[PDB]
Structures are given as structure tokens and as C-alpha cells.
Design a protein around this ligand. Sequence first.
Ligand SMILES: Nc1ncnc2c1ncn2[C@@H]1O[C@H](COP(=O)(O)OP(=O)(O)O)[C@@H](O)[C@H]1O
Ligand SMILES: Nc1ncnc2c1ncn2[C@@H]1O[C@H](COP(=O)(O)OP(=O)(O)O)[C@@H](O)[C@H]1O
Ligand SMILES: Nc1ncnc2c1ncn2[C@@H]1O[C@H](COP(=O)(O)OP(=O)(O)O)[C@@H](O)[C@H]1O
Ligand SMILES: [Mg+2]
Ligand SMILES: [Mg+2]
Ligand SMILES: [Mg+2]
Lengths: 443, 49, 439, 441
Amino acid sequence: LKSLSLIAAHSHITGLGLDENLQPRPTSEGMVGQLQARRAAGVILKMVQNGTIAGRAVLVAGPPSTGKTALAMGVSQSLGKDVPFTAIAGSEIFSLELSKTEALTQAFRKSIGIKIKEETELIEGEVVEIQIDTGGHKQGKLTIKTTDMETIYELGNKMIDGLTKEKVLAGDVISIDKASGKITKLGRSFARSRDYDAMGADTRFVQCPEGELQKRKTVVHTVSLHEIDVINSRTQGFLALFTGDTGEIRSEVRDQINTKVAEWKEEGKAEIVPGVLFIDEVHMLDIECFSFINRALEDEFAPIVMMATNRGVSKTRGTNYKSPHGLPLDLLDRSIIITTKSYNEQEIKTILSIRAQEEEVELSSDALDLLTKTGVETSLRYSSNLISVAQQIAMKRKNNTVEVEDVKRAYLLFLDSARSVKYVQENESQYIDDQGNVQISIA
Amino acid sequence: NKLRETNKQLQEEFGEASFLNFQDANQYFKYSNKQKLEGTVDMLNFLKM
Amino acid sequence: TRTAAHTHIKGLGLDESGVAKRVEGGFVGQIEAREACGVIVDLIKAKKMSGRAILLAGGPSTGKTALALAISQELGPKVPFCPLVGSELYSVEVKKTETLMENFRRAIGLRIKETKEVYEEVTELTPEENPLGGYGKTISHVIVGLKSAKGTKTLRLDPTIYESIQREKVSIGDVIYIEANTGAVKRVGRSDAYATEFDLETEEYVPLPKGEVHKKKEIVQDVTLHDLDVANARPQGGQDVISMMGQLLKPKKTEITEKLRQEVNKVVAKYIDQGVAELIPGVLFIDEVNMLDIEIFTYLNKALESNIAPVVVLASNRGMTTVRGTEDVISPHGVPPDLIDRLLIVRTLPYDKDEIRTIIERRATVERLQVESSALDLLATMGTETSLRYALQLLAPCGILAQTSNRKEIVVNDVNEAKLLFLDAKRSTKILETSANYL
Amino acid sequence: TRTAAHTHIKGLGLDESGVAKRVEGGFVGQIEAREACGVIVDLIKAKKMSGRAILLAGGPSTGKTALALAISQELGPKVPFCPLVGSELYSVEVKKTETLMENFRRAIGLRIKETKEVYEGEVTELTPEDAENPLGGYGKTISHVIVGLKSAKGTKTLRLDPTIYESIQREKVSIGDVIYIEANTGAVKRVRSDAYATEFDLETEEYVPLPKGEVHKKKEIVQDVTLHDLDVANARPQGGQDVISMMGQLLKPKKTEITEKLRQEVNKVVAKYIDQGVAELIPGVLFIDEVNMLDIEIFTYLNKALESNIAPVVVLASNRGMTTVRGTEDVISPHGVPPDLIDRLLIVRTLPYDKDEIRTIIERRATVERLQVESSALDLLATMGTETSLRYALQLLAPCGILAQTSNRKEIVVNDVNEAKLLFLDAKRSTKILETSANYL
Ligand SMILES: Nc1ncnc2c1ncn2[C@@H]1O[C@H](COP(=O)(O)OP(=O)(O)O)[C@@H](O)[C@H]1O
Ligand SMILES: Nc1ncnc2c1ncn2[C@@H]1O[C@H](COP(=O)(O)OP(=O)(O)O)[C@@H](O)[C@H]1O
Ligand SMILES: Nc1ncnc2c1ncn2[C@@H]1O[C@H](COP(=O)(O)OP(=O)(O)O)[C@@H](O)[C@H]1O
Ligand SMILES: [Mg+2]
Ligand SMILES: [Mg+2]
Ligand SMILES: [Mg+2]
């Protein structure tokens, strides 16, 4: 209902096609193939909603375009609401106004959620009439009214002073805290609704409340730990969640608020919920961040952390050795690896068909087969991008269907990555080299 | 709905002010009703926005 | 009446049914690229599907920037268009990825509609008392009157508006317009009715407004979400503490959080669901993308799978180079292969002698200059021999030399002298390598 | 009800006279390391001399962090413990040395204990007792002020010095409803009685009850803070509308280079207070995990700082061998620590476990999280725990429990762990796949 989306790169993924005993369906909710990875993801999910053990590291491997982010999107859709899911890439950790360790700590505190229950008692929209008086400390007893309920209440000097600030005719209905708080204007009644030829932005006509004004209602409140720390970081820091100037909060609010949340949990009025923190593009990161993650995995309030990468054995950012998987061996020791194999021709056909129907594109069978053949030759993302341009060129030819020749025209229009590489190889002199050498004189 | 009823009241009052010098010539109270009706209905449209 | 290597490109010159002729829109040659880019314009104009990227490759002086400008012209002045270069991403105030995110949000715009009823000299004003309480003194009501042109009308209001107009410091006999939405009123000025009240004055004469006592006008506004979230985050106000502090705070932009993005997305979603707002996806242009870095490229992938990602177009001229930040990664156009897998490639080709000659003709025509046939024919000779841009720039000094000897047209010896006066790259480096006096 | 690789360690499990048994405190194996850690615990408990440091070396997953956590548990909830990692020392706001020094001081705490004497209750009548003026005068000269007292389990009546006339000038509670006075210092404190809650249908102040217990109370107050909090509060401003306070309210108070003169002043005041017999300083323990991430500048500043008077006892952890310490390249050193720093502290050696130790560890891990594992499945778990790693086996328990839950069986079976091992790959198999393929994986 609140989908402002035009599309998404993977919007067909809505949960995981599992069942009672967690068996991956062959095709369900924009997801095809890689059954073992889906079963592992379902196991991790059930672990997450178990919510009884923390500090687990799970790593997702695979070649490019294998759909490792597809699993993350699927599990995020599966868990849905009431559980935080922070999708963070590896590049935003580099801030020049905040230590990388501090940013990682903020992310970790973000992924943990806490809900609390609180109950307020208040009389709403019942202040009817003010009977001022002998003199001094006047209006010591005035009635209250709703559309269905009335009562007379006596007022003291303190309540007289409270009413003195922003005095009202009391012919309207005003809500005042019976819980020894303050007053809150609700608006104006219908009697004076036709009293102004011009309007403002201070008071608006308000309905007379229905039922008894007195009400002691309880409210649940959900918030993550990072916000609850930043709110006590300074005298007032509600802008920090908006402006973004956290300011590297010192490690005194953290432990004291951990003790506070433990006390709240023991009182039973607050319930914690361990969310999932997902990190895409992990292979670029500093070794200091890796060690900090190594330690932070041991914390009691450690959310489930899932990593995604595609590089194999390569240099790590911060060292001079080509470590396998792009990560230090220590981190690999304390993690769980879920490899993903390549994709198949039938899987390619199903994925391309799902993409085509996602953007409500009518596709001829032969054009779909040609797209599958190309996606076997080149990457599948190539055809998953060419589908839209083929639809556009078919529209330009005034035929609703995507004929084969339209797809061929789209293919001939845009170069393949390999085709572009080959053409550059043929025309090295024309382009500019890495040594600053280039030729522009044809003759 | 009441103010739309006042629109209808204006219509029955005088033809959206068409019959002012021929029908409403000798009655001024209905004139003062007609000034209120459309103004208040436009104000209540503003109130609904 | 001035140009800088452009502004003679009027659109893409693509006819109906997607066809490009030879000479149109100040554009010649490279038909297939224009066809493809027109298809891209159609896709953007569909406004259905967003989040794509397209990179075009070619040699120097090929018309890539011209292609992008043709795209922007074809789209029109309604859809936002944010040109950019790789270097501007770097900053000393916030992260590179963050600045990329402000640009990303700046690319997409939104058109909003709203109607306003306003009331517009002033006949009189008078407040109406016993507060029936501990308050000192107040007025039960305030009655005022507005003159305007299309008849006058009295007005009854609350002493809050009386206070506001008192703070506006407006004379009793004056012209006033009052906002019905919130009650904000500003001093329009001394109305024309009370002209020459004294011999000498300073207040503006402010001719009396011609219209009804109350006027309703329709306002259509086109803004981007980037203005929206910075407006949300930045505080406002008058004398309140944070207001003065921000007034003296040197408001440097700092790391807009994603919570504002979620909130504004929710609000605009419910507004477009109501049907008052319409979202217009834009196109963001990054010229000379080889200057970016690995971090920017990876976060570019991540932002490219985002929900409200606008269509972006990339430009480069590098070949089998090594992408900055690393040294072991040799990739075409200095773009990492994972990013290359995520967009399309449009090829562009060098021109010929005939095409260069036609470019010279067009460029001479737009600047209101006369070129002799033989002079233009020889201009094409070192246009091909050295470069197109050298001959393109040579034209204005030749025109100046023609102005020297009082002749509107341009002759062969004039351009020969111009070539002798100003050297090209090849001749300059020849002199540099020949000499040994630090030159 | 949740754990993360730890919290099953209940202290060090060291008996009297320093002896460690096999199974205790969730700890098995590495007897001598536990003995040395208990020795260090006793040395810290001596609270006599400070500045000593110790580093412990070993292979990965050898329980170093477990040993540190056990030490922290043994010390108790009074002496402060400051966990830290080498990377956390870096910052973009202050110097690294400033962060190190402030953490050093954050390690050491201070306990202050004191007692106050208070008379409280309900006052039947608040009226001073007039008397003749000793000097030739007139009017009314108060000699004493009688104060009524009324509390649950104890009630009296007493009189006070008429100097409280200014104290009684502003209380705004009631006619002697609930009061709070001091003997030596006097003063008053607004505290209405619950007996008048229902007399008014509305009330914006929650009625307070009468004091319970003796009408006079001698209650003690104990506070435990660190000197870092002390001099942070000393440096940080306070107050309300004054210029400095309002400026700091919008200044985003980033920490910046607390000067040494404040350190000297707080040292002087705490010294004079402990000499006064009212304060007791408690040296703490500070933990730098994964010290190989540090740099030469931090190492040299550490060498300088550990010679200071109030340097707390620190514990260092590393798992490097013949490595090159960061910052430089020519310095080859064990554990990536410069030799001069090594010369200033002792080394504790840890040793790898065996098959039986790994099996016992897996048994403890199964028991703590309320799981049931068959003996054959447990033995198999031990088999690839030895074959690949202990941490992989420890992590694999939860997925096996999930698979068992899928088919509705509380226990765990061999084929369950076979399926779990098939689903989740270890490091060696993963790098085998990585080296076999050529599609960028
Ligand atoms: N198994 C799959 N089921 C459905 N869609 C898939 C699958 N694998 C890949 N895709 C599609 O491929 C696109 C890109 O996949 P992505 O996760 O970015 O690849 P990588 O694993 O290289 O990150 C996604 O939009 C997704 O829709
Ligand atoms: N077909 C064309 N018609 C008109 N002008 C052109 C054409 N091709 C290139 N130009 C000129 O070339 C310039 C753009 O060069 P461009 O190809 O963008 O350089 P680069 O290849 O370095 O991006 C523009 O000023 C434009 O006037
Ligand atoms: N004797 C032991 N008793 C209980 N748990 C142990 C023991 N030895 C190691 N562990 C486990 O090993 C983990 C700590 O590994 P550790 O040796 O600290 O790694 P590193 O060598 O990298 O510091 C803890 O989760 C703990 O449960
Ligand atoms: Mg990888
Ligand atoms: Mg160009
Ligand atoms: Mg350890």
C-alpha cells in the first residue's frame, strides 16, 4: 500500500519459497535455483526469530551476478516488520568526522531493537465552562463535559495557575493530564466555528469527545539501541538522528544504558528484539575494522551479522598479502560460509521470464529463447537490462509484442562488455593509454 | 453536507443571484442569508482541506 | 549571443519512428549513437522504470558531452538534469559516498500543486474586554476592514492576527494582504490612495491592488527531494536559541541520515497516493568518470540497486587502464568489471574529413562569420592533420585578423598567419624536445 | 538467556592455595595459565603497587579472551574493568596518546563512603518559641523552634536553633506534613502526607508517605566513580542561562585534550580526601585486546606512561609470531611488539587443546544452551572439531538444533550434523572451491 517504488532491481523477491519443514520450492516469489543456499538462509532465519543466541557470523560467497544479494533481500522481506534490518555497504564506514570503529559501533547498536510499554491516564476534551469569582484563587470548581458524559471538578490554586497560562473560554473541549502533568489545547467547538472571516494556524475546530473523558491507556514503544543512546548523548540530541552529527559518543552512556535496559528487562516492562545487520561489499575494509568485528561478535547484544562478497584470493585493504576470500583467516575461522553455485539455462529462462512479466512486457517465445542464448553467452544482467530497451524499440515500431528483430536491434545498438573490450583492443591507438599517450592526428 | 444544503438554499433563494432586482428586490433578509451561504460553504471547503 | 563549443546543438534531431538524418539540430554524423540515445530519452520519458545506468565510450573530441547536452535538451526543462564531473565528488566537509547521495537525490524532482485563498487599502481596525480570569487584559474580538479595488469588505478576527499585524508595523491607512492559511501578514507598503500625504516621504507608493477582497490562486511548484530533506534537517525560526546559533553556525552540510530519507519517502508516497503530488524521475550525468575511486564505485553499485535510483549516464575516454585506488586491476575505461556488468555500453566513432568540414561550416555559421570556400577547405586539412578542436578554436583569431584589415570574410593567408602565430600540440612538443634550455 | 561464545565461564575455578581442577567454572584445560591468572588476580587484589603489565601469547581460538573474562569475573563488580581493542585507540577528534591516557585513568576507580544524620517525620505545629531578647530591645526574639515529629515505628518531638527561620521561609508543602532536616547542617527539603489525597478531587503533586522507621536516621551513602569522570566533570562546564553554559549547549562538546593540570588538581584532592579517611582508591584493570594493531607512537607513549605513579595494571593479548610491528618495516619482533616494550612486562604461554579437550568443550557448549546431543553425534562433532577447528564445531550446534526442530526431535542425530556440515562450509573447503574455479570465485 505504501509502495512508492517505480521498480527495484530485484522487486519480485518477496520472502523465501519455503514451507513448514523448510523445503525450498523450485520457484516462488522471484527466486529460482540455489536450493542449498535458500535452505541455509531459512535455517538462519528461523535462528533469528528464535532470538535466544546472539553473536553469530554468517558469510555469503559466490561469483558476480550469482544472486547473493537476492538471498539478503529475500530474508529481509521474510522477516518483515517488527525486526530491524540494517543494509549497510562497506564504503560508508569511511567517515572523516567519525572513527571507523565508532561507525561500526553505531551500526551494531542500530541493529538491536527494544520495545517498552507505558500507560498514561488523562481526561480528554472536558473543561466545560469557567466560573470565575469572592476574588482571588477564583474558578475553583468548573464542570467537565463530553458528547456523552459530564462531571463537576474542583480546582486548586496550582490548577488555577495552570489554567491562567493560555486561558480559554472553556466552551470548547480541552484535554488535560489527570496524571499530574499539564494541559494541552485540543481546539474549538462548533458554536464558534462561524465566528471568523479569516483563519490562522493556532486553533482548529475540534469535535466534542465521545465517551468518558477519563482514560488510562497503555502505549507500546519500539526503538533501536543506537537512537536510545544518542538521545542521552547530550542534553538534547533528537537532531543527531536527523542531522547526523553523533559526535563520537564516549563510552559512558553505552554501559550505563546497557545496565538500564537490563533493569527494564528484569522489570518485564521492556522486551528486546535482536535484528539482523547485513553488510554488502565486505571485501573492501580495513584490518582494524576486521579485528573490531572479531571482538564485537562476543558482545551479549550482538545482532546476527551477514556478509556478502565475490572476490577470491586477493590482497586485503590494509596489508601486503593476498589472503584467500579477501578476508583475514581469523575472521574466516569464526564465521559460517554459504557458497552459491552458478546459474543454469532453465533457471536463466525462468529468471528472464519473471523479469519480463515484472515490467508487464509481452514477450514472444523466440525472442525469449534468443535472450536466454545471449544470457548464456554473456551475463544474465545483460539480457535483464536489454529487455526494457527491446520493449522500447518494439514500441517505436508500433508492435506491442517484443519481436525477435527488435531484440536483435537492441543487441546491435549496445555493446557487450567483452565486445567493448575487443573493440578497444582493435583501436588501442585511438583511446588514451595509462601512460597518458593518445593519438588524435588521423594522418 | 449542511453547507451544500446552503448552496441549494442559495439556488432556491435567487438563481445564484440572478433574480436579485426582480424577485429579491423587496426582501433584504434573504439577501443577508445569500451573502452567508456561499461564503460559509467555501470556508468549510477550506476547512475540509 | 555567446557560445562555448556548444549551444549550437538543438536536441538530438531524431524524427518520428526513431530515425536520424544527416544535418539537423546542429548535429552531423554518428547516427547510431543518436538513435540509441533517443531510445534512452524515450525510456526516461516513460517514467515507469528507474535505476538503470549507461556508459558511452570513445576517443577525445568525439562529442560525448555534446551527446549528453542533446539528451538534456530533448528531455526539456521540466525533468531535472544534474551535470557533474568525477572530481567534484571529493570534498573536505563530508564523505564521498554521502555527496554522491545528495547528487543522487538531487537528480529526481517532484511537481506539487496547491491552491491558496488570500485576502487583500485598510478601511479601519478595532479590537473588542474582561478576560473572566487571572489574565491582565485582552480583546474579545478584532474587527478590521480592507479596501482593495473590487469593492471593500470588513473582517472579524482574533487578537493574535492583531498582534501579528502590529508587529508588522503597518499604518491604519495602508494596503495589507493577509494569508488565510496561517495568518502571516507583511507590510505591503504605503498605498497609492494616500499619495503626497506630506511634501517629502520615503515609503513606496504601492499602487492599490486590482482584484477582489479575497483572491484564490493556483500554485504549481517543482522541487527535488534533495531540497526536501535538507529543509527538514536544517532548523528555522527567529529569536529562539537554536535559531540564532544556526544563524551564526556556518551551516556546513553534514551527513544526512537515512531516517529523513525514509520519512520524506513515506510523506511523498502518501501525497502522490492522495493525488496532489507527481514524481518526475531525473537523469544524473557524471562526466569523465575515470577520476572516481573504488569506494565510490562499490557504493555506486549499492546505490544503483536502490529503490528511487534515477537513470544515470556516464562518460569516459580511457582504455586498458588501471582504475584509481588500486594497481592490480586493469579494466576498460578505468571502470571496475563488476560495475561494467551493471550497465550498457554505447560506442562512438571518430569522424572523417567530410564530417569535420561540415562541423567547421556549422560552427562558422552560428558565430555569424564568413569563410571563403578555399579557406574552409584548407581548415579541414589541418583539422584532419592535427585535430578538430584546434581548427574549431582557430576561427575566432582568424576573424579578428580579418577585422584588422577591414574585411568581413576570411582568406587563406589570414588563416595561414593564424596557424603560424598559435602552435598546436605536435609542434609545441617538437619545440620542447628540440630545445634544452628547460623548454 | 542468550550467550555469545562466552558467559559460560564462571570465574577462574581456582581452589584455595592456588590449584585448578579439571571441570569447574565452565573451564577445562590449560591449568598453568589459570594458575598464573589467579596469581595476577591476587596481586591486583593486594591493591599495593601499580604499573605492572603482562602479555599472553598463543594460537587463535586458544581461550585468551576467555582467560581475560574469567579474570574480570574473579575480580568482582567493585574493581573496574575496561575492555578495549587496539583499533579503538584511533580517533579523528584527539590524539591517540590522549585516548590512551584517558582510558588508563578510566581503568582506576575510587569509592567514597560517608554517613549523614537526618531527623524527619510529620510536624504537628510549625511555630517558633518566642523568648525575651537578651539585648535591650522589643518585639519577638526566638530562642528555640519546636518541631513536631511523626513517623511509622518511631515518633518524638524536638526543638532547634531559631536560625532555621530562613530555612522555613520557603518550603511550600503543607502545615508540617512531611519534613527533612539535618542535625549538624540544618536546612530543609520539600517532601504532602498521604492522609489528604482524597480531600481534593484533583491534585498535580503525588502525595508522599510518612517516614518509615526511627524518627532519626543515620544512613550511609557509598559512591564508586573513576577519576576520568572526575576530571571530565571538572573540565566540563555546568549551569544554566550563563554565557558559557548556553554556548556549550550548542557547541557539540567533542572531547579535546584534557590538560595535565586538572590531573594534578584531582590527584591532590583525592589524596587529601584519602588522607582525611573519607575516600578509598581502588586500582583497576585495563584490557587491550589484539595489541598487534597498535603503532610505534602508541608503544613509546605506553613505555612512558607505565612508569607513572597511577598507571593501572594492564593485560595485553596477541596471536602473532615473527611479525613486523606496524609503522616500521625493519623491526622484526615476536607478536609484533617492539623488544623494549617486551622487556617491561611478563609473558604467559597458552597451549592448544586436544581431541578430548575439544570434546569436553563441545559437551559444555551443548549443556549451557539447553540442548541434547547423542553420544555418537557428539563424538563426530569432536572429530571434525579436531579436523578443522574448534570454533566451527561450536558454531555448528545451533543449525543442528534447528534441523532437529524441523523434524520434531529434541535430540541431535549423526545425519543431522552431516547435513549441517554439507550445508555450511569450513575455511579449507571454501578456499578449495575458490582455487578450483576461475569465474572470479
Ligand atoms: N536465484 C535467483 N532468483 C531470482 N533472481 C535472481 C537470482 N539470482 C540472481 N537474481 C537476480 O539477479 C539480480 C542481481 O543479482 P545480485 O545479487 O546483484 O548478484 P551478486 O550475487 O553478484 O550480487 C537481482 O536483481 C536478482 O533479481
Ligand atoms: N556531430 C557533431 N555535431 C556538432 N558538433 C560536434 C559533433 N561531434 C562533436 N562535436 C563538437 O565536439 C565537442 C564535444 O567533444 P566531445 O566528443 O564531447 O569530447 P570528448 O570525446 O573528449 O568527450 C562539442 O563542442 C561539439 O561542438
Ligand atoms: N578452557 C576453556 N573452557 C571453555 N571455553 C573455552 C576454553 N578454551 C577456549 N574456549 C572457547 O574459545 C573461545 C575463545 O577463544 P580464544 O582462545 O580467546 O581466541 P584467541 O586465541 O583468538 O584469543 C571462547 O568462546 C571459549 O568459549
Ligand atoms: Mg568475494
Ligand atoms: Mg567531450
Ligand atoms: Mg580469543
